Structures are given as C-alpha cells and as structure tokens.
Write a protein that binds this ligand. Structure first.
Ligand SMILES: CCCC[C@H](NC(=O)[C@H](C)NC(=O)[C@H](CCC(=O)O)NC(=O)[C@H](Cc1ccccc1)NC[C@H](CC(C)C)NC(=O)[C@@H](NC(=O)[C@@H](N)CCCNC(N)=[NH2+])C(C)C)C(N)=O
Lengths: 99, 99
C-alpha cells in the first residue's frame, strides 16, 4: 500500500505469535520490539538514537509478518516506547520512500 | 525520486544557507537538526527518542531545501546524533511510504 505521512506510519505486525502495532521507521537501522517473552537464543546489545541508548536482547532470524508481508531477520527486544520496524526488515517487504 | 532502504535514506539539505546531510525519517514526528547557528527566534522545547528526552530550540517557519525540494516549517535544533527530516517536512515535499 501507499502510506501518507500526515500521521505516524503504523501497521499491524505479527511476532512470536502476537499481533502488535508497529511504526515503519526509515530512520531506524534496526527493528526494535517492546519487551516480550520471546523464546530463543539471544545476545545483549545497546542501541542508540535521540536521548541515548537502551539495552536490548538481540534475536537472530526472527520471522515477523508486516502488514501481510513476511520478513525474517534480526529483532531487538527491550524497553522501547513504540514497536519499530527498521530498514533491515523494510527492505524485505519492498518498502520505498517516494516524493 | 524513489528511495530504497538498503542504505540509510540520506539527502543533502540547505538550512540557514548552509548545506548539510540529513536522514529522511518516517519515524520522527519532527525535524531535528544538530547544533548550529540558525537565523531567527526560537523557544525551548523537549523531545523524546529511543534513549530518552533532550532539550531543543524550536524554530518556526524555517525555509529549508530537502534534496532539491523546498519546505518551510518547524525545525528543532539540538544534540541529535543525526540530522533528521521528520514527517512535518516530509509531508511538505510530498513523501509517501510504499510497498
Ligand atoms: C516539537 C515537539 C513535539 C513533541 C515531542 N515529540 C516527540 O518527542 C516525538 C514522539 N519524537 C519522535 O518522533 C522521535 C524523533 C524526534 C522528534 O520527532 O521530535 N522519533 C524517534 O526517536 C524514532 C523512534 C521513536 C518514535 C516515536 C516515539 C518514540 C521513539 N527514532 C528515530 C531514530 C533516528 C536516528 C537517526 C536518530 N532512530 C533510532 O533511534 C534507531 N536507532 C538507530 O537506527 C541506530 N542504530 C543509529 C541511529 C543513531 N545513531 C547514533 N546514535 N550514532 C532505533 C529506533 C533503533 C514530544 N516531546 O513528545
């Protein structure tokens, strides 16, 4: 679909068997999902942005369906304010910025 | 143009007559530029990101050229790790997310 930017570009995603609301963020290199008890092997990571850093658990090869579109890659789980779909997955669903 | 996301969506901008590199950020409500001297009146404001809240100078009705496209709006100046063009200006240049 085509998403206008008058409001935050939020779409429904599915991860770990749960449906969530997520923000399509062209300014995020990574995908960060709110704290959830996702099973699997992980490694500690620190991610930054405006305001500083937050500690997250990095999960490799996690499948997430984004607005009906399947993707698979690295997902960071931690105390993020909103669910963020970054470029690592955006490229997988064929998302582009157009103007 | 159509911008894919394999690489960060960086563009050249012109603000205060000075050229800079900025990231087209669909996940940012506002446009936040690194500390710089900008002609005009400003008011103290606080914004939040992934790592926390930071203090910024809010400049209203600023003329800024984004990748050759002109926009005139709110620009926040502060300690941001990267110059970001948020939705307030992305809508002005007619940017949409597509997939
Ligand atoms: C005028 C005031 C308006 C009101 C004001 N509004 C805000 O604070 C709103 C919610 N903030 C935002 O929309 C801010 C951007 C700042 C802004 O627009 O003001 N957005 C953001 O901060 C969004 C995530 C988010 C979205 C909504 C809510 C909370 C967080 N992240 C944008 C950000 C861009 C980056 C280049 C700086 N990306 C990231 O932080 C991602 N990080 C990365 O991709 C890193 N790997 C590399 C970038 C950082 N580099 C570095 N540290 N050397 C992260 C999500 C994995 C308020 N106080 O509520």
């Amino acid at each position: 679909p085509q998403i206008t930017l008058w409001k935050r570009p939020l779409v429904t995603i599915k991860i770990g068997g749960q449906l969530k609301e997520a923000l399509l963020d062209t300014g995020a290199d990574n995908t960060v999902i709110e704290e959830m008890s996702l099973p699997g092997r992980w490694k500690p990571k620190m991610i930054g942005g405006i305001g500083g850093f937050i500690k997250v658990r990095q999960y490799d090869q996690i499948i997430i369906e984004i607005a009906g579109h399947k993707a698979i890659g690295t997902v960071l789980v931690g105390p993020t304010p909103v669910n963020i779909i970054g470029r690592n997955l955006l490229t997988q669903i064929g998302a582009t910025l157009n103007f």
